[PDB]
Amino acid sequence: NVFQTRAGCLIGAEHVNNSYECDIPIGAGICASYQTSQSIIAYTMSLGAENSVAYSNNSIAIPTNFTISVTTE
Amino acid sequence: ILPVSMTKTSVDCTMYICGDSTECSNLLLQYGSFCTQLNRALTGIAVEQDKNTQEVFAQVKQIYKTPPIKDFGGFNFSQILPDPSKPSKRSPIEDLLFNKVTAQKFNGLTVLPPLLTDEMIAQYTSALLAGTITSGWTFGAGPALQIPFPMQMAYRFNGIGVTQNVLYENQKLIANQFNSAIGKIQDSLSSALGKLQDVVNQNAQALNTLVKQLSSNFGAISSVLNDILSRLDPPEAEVQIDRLITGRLQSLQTYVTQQLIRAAEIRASANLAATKMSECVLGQSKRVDFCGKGYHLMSFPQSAPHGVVFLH
Amino acid sequence: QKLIANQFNSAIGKIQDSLSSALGKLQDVVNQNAQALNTLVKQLSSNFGAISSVLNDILSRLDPPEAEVQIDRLITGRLQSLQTYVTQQLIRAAEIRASANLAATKMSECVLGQSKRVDFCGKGYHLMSFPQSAPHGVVFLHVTYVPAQEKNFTTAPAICHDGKAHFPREGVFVSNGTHWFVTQRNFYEPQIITTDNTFVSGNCDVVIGIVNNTVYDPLQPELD
Amino acid sequence: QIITTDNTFVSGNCDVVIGIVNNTVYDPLQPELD
Ligand SMILES: *[C@@H]1O[C@H](CO)[C@@H](O[C@@H]2O[C@H](CO)[C@@H](O)[C@H](O)[C@H]2NC(C)=O)[C@H](O)[C@H]1NC(C)=O
Ligand SMILES: *[C@@H]1O[C@H](CO)[C@@H](O[C@@H]2O[C@H](CO)[C@@H](O)[C@H](O)[C@H]2NC(C)=O)[C@H](O)[C@H]1NC(C)=O
Ligand SMILES: *[C@@H]1O[C@H](CO)[C@@H](O)[C@H](O)[C@H]1NC(C)=O
Ligand SMILES: *[C@@H]1O[C@H](CO)[C@@H](O)[C@H](O)[C@H]1NC(C)=O
Ligand SMILES: *[C@@H]1O[C@H](CO)[C@@H](O)[C@H](O)[C@H]1NC(C)=O
Ligand SMILES: *[C@@H]1O[C@H](CO)[C@@H](O)[C@H](O)[C@H]1NC(C)=O
Ligand SMILES: *[C@@H]1O[C@H](CO)[C@@H](O)[C@H](O)[C@H]1NC(C)=O
Ligand SMILES: *[C@@H]1O[C@H](CO)[C@@H](O)[C@H](O)[C@H]1NC(C)=O
């Protein structure tokens, strides 16, 4: 319902602690989206895929395959 | 030192021109077309100010975690990595730059917050620094790989014409010269910046000019429109109100035009910093004398308030 | 060759299926010009602080010696909008010139040859581009090179055989647990450790971490 | 220039290219070991 965000006041949208990729920008690191019925929810946006990269002094990674893609600018 | 964004200011005509009366709203309908242009121009600035951050810092869509192994072959990376002793994500360096560089909203000159705060910008630089020390260039041009640092320095030397046999002969010498170069930058930055201060001083003097525009008469008998309505009748003081409206409309057209040139200078510096991020940071730039004076090998970008810094 | 030809035809079909489903860079330059032209016709419907909008209305009810002030307010009121539309078009012309000079540098590097700057013509290793015509603009169909599958292998910085260190030239020494091969950092191509791809310099006791490995020596069994 | 060994290398087998021809190598190492 009413959520006191850091960028002012967002009313009419419940808050959820889960983080997903947001579409509509709002500001102050929090977005507003429409996910699961389904209602408009406000949550902190995800900065990327939270993964760990294994680093070692005697380990290398050589790719064996590739995909030919086309980047449209 | 290269800035990428600045402060966001949203100026209204009805709060800035008109005060707390209804006689000003009747004359503002004749100049409503001028505020459709000034409101759309200030809206175009705020989207461009939020889009320049996604072009420099948001180069990848994956957050790379810092590895627990701090043994990089004799190199000191504690100055570029966030220490767990403080709750903030800024490193010692990034924290030294936050305190190095330094109401206005009372007259309707409200400052809107950006899309990404200083904590998410510090997380973007730590994610790019984690992928540079672990993959180097494959994380910005494809999926993430693993490669040790020394092996990574040998491939950067091959791009400038140096064979990779001399790196493994004095590894303790270059590791001591790298730690001495970080300490010389930290000792020089602790003693202000120019490119991160002129963008703030120009915006501070422009906001202090708009409040001074309300203290002028623009060729009339008074400054504020509430003073002439108490001593004269609106049928008589209608010419003095119109002179204050077109006097404030000229300053509002000047402030928007002056902010659009500063927004074009920010866009020109953000596109220049985005090309340096994809070349000096994301890999090795083949253009000599582009990332600084000397043969460029790699870079270490950090977070900066309303800007970005590069340690090549 | 049949794998790259099939991956290239699938990449063209994925772009054609995505573009058939509007653009942003080719629409914001038209919507900003359409709203600016619609604003100028709205400026003729305002009075600029007068009793009428058009100058032909005040001349039919009042005399020009009397309505000379209302005409000057309409001229100076339209001169401010004409100075605003020209100034707003000059910033859009500077943004067009800044994008045309950026597209001219990408035409001479990504299209006219191979651009040595990595991550410049798009996300990934750029090989070539295919520029097409666009209304009030231009598009570029680059050919990127991104990896999909990868494996982890144990590497070595040098090779100690008889007291001298062996350093590679283009590849890196890899090993999957019991063998030893050499391949580049962009594609997995296992090759035997030979003399034509390595060289010697100094002694062996120069690297902090080294292992023992033998050389195939493709010159010894030929002189017998 | 003459087709030598210092400028060429081998990888895999011959039946990998859709169009290929037969050509000999000068082999600048064979006449020196005699
Ligand atoms: C690299 O990836 C491509 C794309 O998936 C693989 O090509 C496929 O191979 C399978 C089996 O060989 C076929 O059934 C598919 O039709 C192929 N797809 C295309 C688009 O050609 C390729 O095999 C992979 N190579 C390696 C070494 O893993
Ligand atoms: C890397 O540099 C940091 C400098 O920040 C070193 O930390 C200092 O270490 C000395 C030696 O004990 C202490 O007296 C200082 O108080 C430390 N300063 C800070 C801010 O922690 C660190 O030792 C260096 N690491 C290596 C391996 O050389
Ligand atoms: C989300 O989970 C955290 C976990 O402790 C909890 O503290 C928080 O209250 C939760 N938020 C909501 C909206 O349920
Ligand atoms: C991987 O190791 C196994 C261990 O026996 C070996 O048989 C195999 O040839 C290795 N892979 C390659 C590509 O050499
Ligand atoms: C990698 O670092 C660890 C930790 O110091 C060390 O024990 C190990 O020997 C190192 N490996 C090599 C190949 O130097
Ligand atoms: C094999 O490796 C060990 C450890 O690095 C080294 O002490 C030894 O001399 C090597 N053997 C030869 C024949 O060089
Ligand atoms: C070139 O293409 C033609 C047409 O298919 C074909 O007949 C010819 O054999 C090709 N040449 C080579 C060298 O493959
Ligand atoms: C000569 O070329 C033909 C056609 O490509 C091929 O069938 C034949 O095997 C080649 N000769 C040799 C000795 O490889």
From Swiss-Prot, chain B:
Changing N107K: In strain: Omicron/BA.1. Changing D71H: In strain: B.1.1.318. The record marks R90, S91 as: Cleavage. Changing N39K: In strain: Omicron/BA.1, Omicron/BA.2, Omicron/BA.2.12.1, Omicron/BA.2.75, Omicron/BA.4, Omicron/BA.5, Omicron/BQ.1.1, Omicron/XBB.1.5, Omicron/EG.5.1. Disulfide bonds join C13-C35, C18-C24, C280-C291. Residues 171-218 are annotated as: Heptad repeat 1. Precursor of the fusion protein processed in the biosynthesis of the S protein and the formation of virus particle. Mediates fusion of the virion and cellular membranes by functioning as a class I viral fusion protein. Contains two viral fusion peptides that are unmasked after cleavage. The S2/S2' cleavage occurs during virus entry at the cell membrane by host TMPRSS2 or during endocytosis by host CSTL. This is Spike protein S2. It comes from Severe acute respiratory syndrome coronavirus 2. The lineage of its organism: Viruses, Riboviria, Orthornavirae, Pisuviricota, Pisoniviricetes. The chain holds residues 726 to 1064 of 1273 of the full protein.
Swiss-Prot record, chain C:
Glycans are attached at N152, N176, N212. Changing S60A: In strain: Alpha/B.1.1.7. Residues 27-71 form a coiled coil. Disulfide bonds join C110-C121, C160-C204. It comes from the Viruses. Residues 1-48 are annotated as: Heptad repeat 1. Changing Q149H: In strain: Kappa/B.1.617.1. Subunit of the fusion protein that is processed upon entry into the host cell. Mediates fusion of the virion and cellular membranes by functioning as a class I viral fusion protein. Contains a viral fusion peptide that is unmasked after S2 cleavage. This cleavage can occur at the cell membrane by host TMPRSS2 or during endocytosis by host CSTL. In either case, this triggers an extensive and irreversible conformational change that leads to fusion of the viral envelope with the cellular cytoplasmic membrane, releasing viral genomic RNA into the host cell cytoplasm. This is Spike protein S2'. It comes from Severe acute respiratory syndrome coronavirus 2 (2019-nCoV).
